[PDB]
């Protein structure tokens, strides 16, 4: 559970990237818009990190279900005296890649949502409305999708 610090160290990143094009093509005022940016990033980091945990927690078992036979093979190739290696390593063996895919997929999911909203729906809308609706919808919808 204490590993959540990494999730907090990851969920915020993507939330702020679009500021470049917004300042370049939407020409947003970074001073006035900082009020919107801070809230958007904070909410995104909160729910997205929670989603990271949920996805990995919900699916980590499958990793062992698939490859535990191979991991056991290499563990032995290297019953009480034998099982300890299972607790020390095997559980993390499944966990380690489970996290990597969970975060990877979540980040991959986020990008298209903002692209579609900003440059295919909110094309015809105020840059203020463009950023507001695009980012707010992305955060809320993606978090709900993660609960799917």
């Amino acid at each position: 559970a204490k590993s959540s610090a990494l999730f907090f160290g990851n969920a915020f990143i993507v939330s702020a990237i679009p500021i470049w094009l917004y300042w370049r093509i939407w020409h947003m005022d970074l001073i006035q818009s900082a009020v919107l940016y801070s809230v958007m990033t904070l909410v995104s980091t909160y729910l997205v990190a929670f989603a990271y945990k949920n996805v990995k927690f919900v699916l980590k078992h499958k990793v062992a279900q698939k490859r535990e036979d191979a991991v056991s093979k290499e563990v032995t190739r290297k019953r009480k005296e034998k099982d300890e290696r299972i607790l020390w390593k095997k559980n993390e063996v499944a966990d380690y890649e489970a996290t990597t895919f969970s975060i990877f997929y979540n980040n991959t999911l986020f990008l298209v949502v903002v692209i579609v909203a900003s440059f295919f729906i909110l094309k015809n809308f105020n840059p203020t409305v463009n950023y507001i609706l695009s980012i707010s919808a992305s955060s809320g919808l993606i978090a709900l999708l993660s609960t799917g």
Partner: protein
């Protein structure tokens, strides 16, 4: 005289030009390059033309067509509507978000697959 120097800088050309003679069935084209210094609505009024229809004749005064009222877009608004290379630079800026997990996931898979 429709373009006051306080609102338009002359980059090239002249608002005032004289030609000694224009032959019959001939034409002359003049081009002026200005630079608007302020955004807003501007009325492109007609220019005045004076000429002699005959030697020692009376000066005939004519007017050009008037393009009418045009909008001068603010540079920020023009860029907002029509701003290319921004995406060229932006594309790379998005990569770092997934650098670590992207490499680690497959590295672990290969070590176990």
């Amino acid at each position: 005289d429709s373009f006051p120097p306080e609102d338009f800088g002359i980059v090239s050309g002249m608002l005032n030009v004289k030609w000694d003679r224009i032959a019959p069935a001939s034409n002359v084209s003049h081009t002026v390059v200005l630079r608007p210094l302020k955004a807003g609505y501007f009325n492109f009024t007609s220019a005045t033309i004076t000429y002699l229809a005959q030697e020692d004749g009376p000066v005939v005064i004519g007017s050009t067509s008037a393009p009418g009222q045009g909008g001068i877009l603010a540079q920020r608004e023009f860029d907002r509507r029509f701003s290319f290379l921004d995406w060229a630079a932006f594309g790379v800026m998005t990569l770092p978000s997934i650098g670590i997990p992207l490499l680690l996931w497959y590295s672990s898979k290969r070590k176990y697959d």
